[PDB]
């Protein structure tokens, strides 16, 4: 399983039409659930209980977003609508160009995702933890919008 | 992070107190759980085995509904008859004066 | 330094799922920009669409993959900027990559690669031939498309 | 593809017949040149030896510019002065209100 170099970009237009940035790099890992591919797109956080088969017409997000899903301690939801792979699959069906799980509270998720390696999704499914995870989350909760660039070297 | 049984900094509400309904709120990038007394406009309740849950009001030119197919406020240009909006009021009921409703 | 470009047409369904169509095409990474993979909404820029002489320009959402069909260099004998300049200018206005259609002006390839000393942070790709025809046709024919550019 | 000295399927007009105004039209993904007699509404001309181009009228409160700093048409209600747009005409120019001007 390869290393996922992720950059999260904050951007602001100036008056002249040009852009200024700020860019936080993190590390993660590409799962075998998904392809080994770089991906870039606006980040969209997805609550874990908000990725399910069950809903007949879910809300619509522009094609080519990057999901971010903070997983919670596995016992806080014992009868989940879908497994962590199912959730990944939804995201991508709904147009995620990649999905990043934060697995800090749920390190078992990793092995589950990798047990999806026959039938892997066409798009990348990265996971992040620890300090790398804390960063991503801080940005998500605190800032308005952000762009992820995930590289596979 | 309120009305909440389980609760996290990043996901808001994860479990509601039982007579409260779970709603996924988008605030820009973020999507977090809220535990609400009543569903907000455009949504309606469901009290359920997995959860008590706020579903999307799926109904014809109508902002708010109570149920699966009972509309409350239609969007104007509609005539609310027996909970389903319509084009005209049907033969039997009439568009009210200064009302958006049938008889 | 080969650029593997995919152009992706997409439609939502009633379910809220997407279906797509994807055209793969090939170009090269100019040494004028970083040798990095890139993905974004394609935005076409007219060659003159990229000139320094405006105090404020119209604003595109950060993250776009500009495309520029270059013309025979005599159609503008004295350009507002070089290609290098136009490329820089695009990235300053937030383009995440820049793809040049150099078919009608292949020495831009050289002019461009002259930037290898002060290179842009983002990729600058050039296409031509069939690859460029496919790119231009889609751009002409459709409302939107997502470019994925890869460095493998 | 008219008004046009040079012209391409891919970029539309590339240079304009000398009296006419070069305009970038946005149309989905496309950006191509038009050569116009009048800059369209919301725009104004910037005639030059090299060429004439249209520019976005960016006067706060104004609809159509004659030029960068001079508004032709204020939006609904507003008051006109030095061809700027106003809520009410400031001190030292008595707003002849009927007319939506100052004096």
Author numbering:
A (entry chain A): 53 to 205
B (entry chain B), D (entry chain D): 40 to 142
C (entry chain C): 54 to 205
Reproduce, without paraphrasing, sentences from the article in which this PDB structure was first reported:
Rspo (R-spondin, also roof plate-specific spondin) proteins are evolutionarily conserved from fish to humans and have well-documented roles in a broad range of developmental and physiological processes resulting from enhancement of canonical and non-canonical Wnt signalling. ZNRF3/RNF43 specifically targets these Wnt receptors for ubiquitination and turnover, hence reducing Wnt signalling responses. Direct extracellular interaction with Rspo proteins inhibits ZNRF3/RNF43 activity. Here we report a molecular level analysis of the ZNRF3/RNF43 ectodomain structure and its interactions with Rspo proteins.
By using a combination of heavy atom and molecular-replacement-based phasing strategies, we determined multiple crystal structures for Xenopus (x) Rspo2Fu1–Fu2 (highest resolution 2.2 Å), xZNRF3ecto, zebrafish (z) ZNRF3ecto and mouse (m) ZNRF3ecto, (highest resolutions 2.4, 1.6 and 2.0 Å, respectively), plus complexes comprising xZNRF3ecto–xRspo2Fu1–Fu2, mZNRF3ecto–mRspo2Fu1–Fu2, mZNRF3ecto–xRspo2Fu1–Fu2 and xRNF4F3ecto–xRspo2Fu1–Fu2 (at 2.1, 2.8, 2.4 and 2.7 Å, respectively). The crystal structures of the ZNRF3ecto–Rspo2Fu1–Fu2 and RNF43ecto–Rspo2Fu1–Fu2 complexes revealed a 1:1 interaction between Fu1 of the Rspo2Fu1–Fu2 and a single ZNRF3ecto or RNF43ecto chain. The first, extensive, area of interaction involves hydrophobic interactions interspersed with hydrophilic (complementarily charged) patches contributed by the first two β-hairpins of the Rspo Fu1 and the region immediately carboxy-terminal to the β3 strand of ZNRF3ecto. The Met-finger at the tip of the second β-hairpin of Fu1 nestles into a pocket formed between the β3 strand and the αC–β7 loop of the ZNRF3ecto, which is lined with hydrophobic residues (I95, I191, V192, A198). The αC–β7 loop is a flexible region in the unliganded ZNRF3ecto crystal structures and moulds to interface the RspoFu1–Fu2 M68 in the complex. The acidic region of the β3–β4 loop (immediately adjacent to C104 of the disulphide bridge) becomes more ordered in the ligand-bound ZNRF3ecto structures, probably as a result of electrostatic interactions with a positively charged patch on Rspo Fu1. For all ZNRF3ecto–Rspo2Fu1–Fu2 complex structures we determined (from five different combinations of species and crystal forms), the dimer found in most of the unliganded ZNRF3ecto crystal structures reoccurs. The overall assembly thus comprises a 2:2 complex of ZNRF3ecto–Rspo2Fu1–Fu2. The 2:2 complex resembles a crab with the ZNRF3ecto dimer forming the body from which the two Rspo2Fu1–Fu2 ligands diverge, without interacting with each other, as the pincers. Notably, the β1–β2 hairpin shows less conformational variation in the liganded ZNRF3ecto dimer structures, always maintaining a tight embrace, consistent with the Rspo2Fu1–Fu2 interactions contributing an indirect stabilizing effect on the dimer via the β3–β4 loop.
